[PDB]
Amino acid sequence: TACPEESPLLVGPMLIEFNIPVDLKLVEQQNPKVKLGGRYTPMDCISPHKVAIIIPFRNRQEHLKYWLYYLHPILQRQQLDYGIYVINQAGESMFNRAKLLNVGFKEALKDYDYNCFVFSDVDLIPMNDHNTYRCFSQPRHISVAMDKFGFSLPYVQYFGGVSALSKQQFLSINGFPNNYWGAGGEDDDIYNRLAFRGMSVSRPNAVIGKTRMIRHSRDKKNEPNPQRFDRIAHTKETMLSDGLNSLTYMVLEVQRYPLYTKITVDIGTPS
């Protein structure tokens, strides 16, 4: 009565385009099984993958629409017991991707006992459904072959875009840093943390992991972070003082839409 190791519904390579406008109402109609808040649990078998998908966010509604359009049918085909969480950063301080991802972990766990967390940027859509959005023996890097980088890993130490850590693996590294404000570095620090814990990085192959990115302009308030290179050099030490243990935030609003949950939070300002 437990779901097969590999889903029988998978189709493989998929045509991913971003030209036709999306209507969430249609998406909802097309996805009956998805309950309020963007929750789904397969009815046939029992899935061992209780997955919370966290998406850092601020003013990317159009991208979210495409993400929802493509991911929902895929996530169901992957036979996952999942929930969609869009962590919205209130205000206008420098965007803090990693902190928002931390919030998603905490907040999600209040809704259900997830044992797996997939952290994904709002503009990346997987091209092959064999690229399962779940957890593995080791931290999983999912967006391994982005068009942005010629369908290849930008650098072997890359852990950005879309990645997943089991609950244990996440607590294992004290979650993610909260001190990275502005663009760049946070993902390398997270990568550093995995190493400083004997954990390695699991990855599908460059073809099963092809990923499309919705091209956009550099968002306001997300300029490269000046001190990102100094920070990634002291992860072994800072990871002890910067993480879940030090995370603080104020939830301003929780919104439950039929296709996803949007939690708007005040994460403070750069120290």
Binding site: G150, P154, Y155, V156, Q157, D188, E223, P224, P226, F229, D230, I232, A233
Partner: protein
């Protein structure tokens, strides 16, 4: 223009081995520094860094913000925003000769290991 590893490796051929930095190391450095973007413009603190090598107008090139900047490279920062890397390379050399590879903050943390991946196996 957003070049590729190979395109960059070939373009900066003349800087190879200068100050003991290989092309592999540079390919690594430039990717992290500007993502191989010849038109990159970033505001590190109160100054602005230009182009592929992200040369700063604080002391190296001359812009409008820093009129009396040292402009040690003797060049307008705007010449570091085109696709002719010969003058960006010459300026990079001066920086290597005066400050060293450490001007490029990405070198130590991201390019001290696994350099072979940065090699362009193109003829």
């Amino acid at each position: 223009t957003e070049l590729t590893k190979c395109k960059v490796s070939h373009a900066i051929k003349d800087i190879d081995g200068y100050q003991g930095i290989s092309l592999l190391e540079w390919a690594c450095v430039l990717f992290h520094t500007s993502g191989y973007d010849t038109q990159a413009v970033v505001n590190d603190n109160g100054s602005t860094e230009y182009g592929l090598f992200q040369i700063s107008d604080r002391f190296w090139c001359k812009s409008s913000e820093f009129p009396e900047s040292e402009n040690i490279c003797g060049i307008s920062c705007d010449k570091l925003l085109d696709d002719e890397l010969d003058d960006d390379i010459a300026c990079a050399k001066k920086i290597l000769a005066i400050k060293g590879i450490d001007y490029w903050k990405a070198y130590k943390p991201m390019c001290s290991e696994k350099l072979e991946q940065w090699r362009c196996e193109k003829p």
